[PDB]
Amino acid sequence: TINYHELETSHGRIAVRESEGEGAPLLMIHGNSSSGAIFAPQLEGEIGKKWRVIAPDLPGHGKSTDAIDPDRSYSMEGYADAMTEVMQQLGIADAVVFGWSLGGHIGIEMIARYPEMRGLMITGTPPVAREEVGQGFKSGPDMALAGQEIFSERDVESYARSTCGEPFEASLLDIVARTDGRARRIMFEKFGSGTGGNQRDIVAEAQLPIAVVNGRDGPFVELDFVSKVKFGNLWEGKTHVIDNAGHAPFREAPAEFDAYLARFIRDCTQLEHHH
Ligand SMILES: CCCCCC(=O)N[C@@H](CCO)C(=O)O
């Protein structure tokens, strides 16, 4: 049973899905033009059965309302503010955070705002300074869509297929089509204007465990670049790659992805802590 409910926040009304797991909490943050519903395999599977999985919809996405103030909310740092507010309302200060793509960038911004975070896993996310975008991401037509306000029906399909990968389901179109397109345009411009913290520096200096897990065949992330990024505390000492998966290994290869996520949560929450 997934517990769905909505929170009135300063950013607007935020939809939240929670599993019924009694264990330590895991915040899962979805990507650009997605929603927390994308994390069905974790919410409804072994991860969500054990751990308290929380999968909200960002402002402008899914079942959340559009942002009260797009100029405040639609940016990596603005979304980080919104998710921090959500966690405060839920009374949870020490979640492990999993961020998918845009969600991973948001998670990086959350490090400063959510100091008791027990770990951060990023998938589909190259930590990059603004000038490093070409190094961290692969060039292509779906990539251009990341910052494009208006999607035709065909842009909806191309974007959904490239970002969500196999298997494609019609329900994915509904999610992408709903997205407030202003959020794409504004977030992308602000990323390029360096309005938030330098993500390269943030992850280099961050002391909490950061896990990096990607599909080998994703169309967006430069995996070699990611494997060279400096992290303060890289979980298991390397970046991890799942064969036969693209941008969304949590749905494309759930068992393999869940092995990493479960082990990371265990490591971050159930080992004796020494500074
Ligand atoms: C080039 C800037 C990318 C910003 C983050 C983003 O939109 N990530 C997408 C993946 C890239 O299309 C996602 O959340 O899936």
Numbering used by the authors: 2 to 276
Give sentences from the paper.
N-Acyl homoserine lactonases (AHL-lactonases) have important functions in decreasing pathogenicity by degrading AHLs. AidH contains a substrate-binding tunnel between the core domain and the cap domain. Taken together, the present results reveal the catalytic mechanism of the metal-independent AHL-lactonase, which is a typical acid–base covalent catalysis.
We also solved the crystal structure of AidHE219G–C6-HS at 1.11 Å resolution. Surprisingly, the mutant AidHE219G is not completely inactive and the activity of AidHY160G is significantly decreased. The absence of the Glu219 side chain causes the backbone of the loop between β7 and α5 to shift by 1 Å. The biochemical data demonstrate that the Glu219→Gly mutation weakens the His-dependent solvent-assisted deprotonation and thus decreases the activity of AidH. Two possible conformations of the newly formed hydroxyl group are found. The low-quality electron density and higher B factor (31.5 Å2) in this region indicate that the AHL tail is relatively flexible.
